[PDB]
Amino acid sequence: MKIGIIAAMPEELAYLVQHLDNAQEQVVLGNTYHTGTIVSHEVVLVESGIGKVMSAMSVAILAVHFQVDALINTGSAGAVAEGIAVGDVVIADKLAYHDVDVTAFGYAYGQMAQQPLYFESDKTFVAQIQESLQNWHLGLIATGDSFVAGNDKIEAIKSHFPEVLAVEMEGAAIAQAAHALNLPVLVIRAMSDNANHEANIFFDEFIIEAGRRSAQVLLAFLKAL
Amino acid sequence: MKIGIIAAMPEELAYLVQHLDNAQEQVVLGNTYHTGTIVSHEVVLVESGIGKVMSAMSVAILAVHFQVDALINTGSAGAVAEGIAVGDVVIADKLAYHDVDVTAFGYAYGQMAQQPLYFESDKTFVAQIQESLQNWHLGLIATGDSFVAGNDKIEAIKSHFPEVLAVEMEGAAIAQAAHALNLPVLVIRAMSDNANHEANIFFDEFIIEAGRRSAQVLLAFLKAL
Numbered sequence A, B: 001m002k003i004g005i006i007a008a009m010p011e012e013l014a015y016l017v018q019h020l021d022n023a024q025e026q027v028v029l030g031n032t033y034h035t036g037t038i039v040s041h042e043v044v045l046v047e048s049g050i051g052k053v054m055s056a057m058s059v060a061i062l063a064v065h066f067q068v069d070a071l072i073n074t075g076s077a078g079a080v081a082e083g084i085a086v087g088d089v090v091i092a093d094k095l096a097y098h099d100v101d102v103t104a105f106g107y108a109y110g111q112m113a114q115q116p117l118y119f120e121s122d123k124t125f126v127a128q129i130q131e132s133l134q135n136w137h138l139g140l141i142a143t144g145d146s147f148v149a150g151n152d153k154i155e156a157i158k159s160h161f162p163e164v165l166a167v168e169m170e171g172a173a174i175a176q177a178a179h180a181l182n183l184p185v186l187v188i189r190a191m192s193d194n195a196n197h198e199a200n201i202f203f204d205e206f207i208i209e210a211g212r213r214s215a216q217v218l219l220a221f222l223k224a225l
C-alpha cells in the first residue's frame, strides 16, 4: 500500500520528513507533498493546514492525485479524560464531531447529515499498532473547528460524548473524507495540553514533543506493517 | 474559463443538470461529476454532499482533477436578516464561519487559524451578476456545520456577526478551499426558510424552489459572462 500521511502543522510532520528515504517534493496547488519511502513503505507526506476544510482537501488530493491506498493522520491533541496525561498517546478507535448539530432532522448530536455519528480508525491497523505499542490509550477523539481552551467547553463536549479521551480539529474530518473516498485511515495523537484555560500556553511549549511522540508511534507501526 | 459548479444537495443541482449541453458523467471516487457546457461555458457540475468536509473535497477535486479556473456555489440557505423574505436571493459579498473559535490564540471569533476572518465572492463576478440581476440582497452569509433551527441559535450568530443575511453549511468552506487553491468563487443562495424553530419543515417544502431560484440566477450570470 501507498500510504498518505497527514499532519495539520509543520511541527507534527517534521520528524517524519527526517525519516523519509529518497525524499522528493511536489507542489500541488500551493502545498508541498513529500514522496519517498519510510522503512520500505511508499508514502506521501503533507502538512494539510489546520481544521476541517484543510484536512479534507489533503485527503481528496492524496486520494485523487497521488492515488494512495490508505491514510495515517498524526499530531497533537488536548487531553480531557481521566488518566490521560500530557505526553500520552491516544489511538482513536472512534471519531466524532463535537460541534455538529443537524438534530432538527433527527440526526444524533454530532452527526453530520448523510454520515454516521462515529467514524473509526481501520480495525486491522488498530489491532497491529496496539501490538507494536509510551503510555497510551484507545478510545474516542472528538473533533471540532475550535481550539478547546476552557473547562466550560470541555464539559460541554463531555455532556455529548462522556467517553471522549482527547479533542482536536481534524480527526473526524479526515475520517469523514477517507470514508467518503473509500480509504482506510488510522488516527494517532499525542497530548500537548489539557484543553483548559491554559491550553494555548502548554500547546506552545509542548507541540514539538507531542508531534514527535505521535510520529514515533507512527514509525513503530510502519516498521511492523 | 472552465467553471466548476458546486451544490450541496441534488435539489440544488437538478435545474442546472437540465440545462447542461453535451452532458457527460464521470465518476471520481464515488461521486458523479457532470461535464459539458452551459450557454457556451465549459462547466463541471457536482453535488458535493452536505457540510464543510464534503464541500472542501469537491473544490479540491474540481481544482486538481478537472483543472477548473473558477467556481460558482449555488443552493438554499436560511434567511435571518431584516427585509429578507423566503424566496429571496442573497449574493455573498463576504463569507465567514459562525461556529469557529480559535480565540485562545488571538484570532477573531469565527476566524479559522491561518485564515482571514472573511472570505469573499470574487469582486468582478459580483459586479457582473448585480448587473444581470427576483428580489435579491448583497451581503454576508455565515457558515457552520449545523442546520440552524431556532431563534436562540440565530441570535447567537448575530451577536458575532450583526450584519449576517443568511446561514448555511458550505459557503465559507467552499470559499476557504477556493482561496487556498487560488481560485475565484461566486456564492449564491435562495432562501428556503427562516432558520427558526420550524426551519426543517419549511426547508422540506421549499428546497426545490429555492434550489431552482438560485440556479436561475446562476444561469443569468453565465448568459452575461
Ligand SMILES: Nc1nc2c(N)ncnc2[nH]1
Pocket: A108, A117, A118
Ligand atoms: N445515533 C447513534 N448512536 C450510535 C451508537 N451508540 N453507536 C454507533 N452509532 C450510533 N448512531
Ligand SMILES: Nc1nc2c(N)ncnc2[nH]1
Pocket: A076, A077, A078, A146, A147, A148, A149, A167, A168, A169, A191, A192, A193, A194, A195, A196, A199, A203
Ligand atoms: N494539540 C492540540 N490541543 C488542542 C486543543 N486543546 N483543542 C483543539 N485542538 C488541539 N490540538
Ligand SMILES: Nc1nc2c(N)ncnc2[nH]1
Pocket: B108, B117, B118
Ligand atoms: N479581526 C478582523 N476584523 C476584520 C474586519 N472588520 N474586516 C476584515 N477583516 C477583519 N479581521
Ligand SMILES: Nc1nc2c(N)ncnc2[nH]1
Pocket: B076, B077, B078, B146, B147, B148, B149, B167, B168, B169, B191, B192, B193, B194, B195, B196, B199, B203
Ligand atoms: N436551505 C437551508 N436552510 C438552512 C438552515 N436554516 N441552516 C443551515 N443550512 C441551511 N440551508
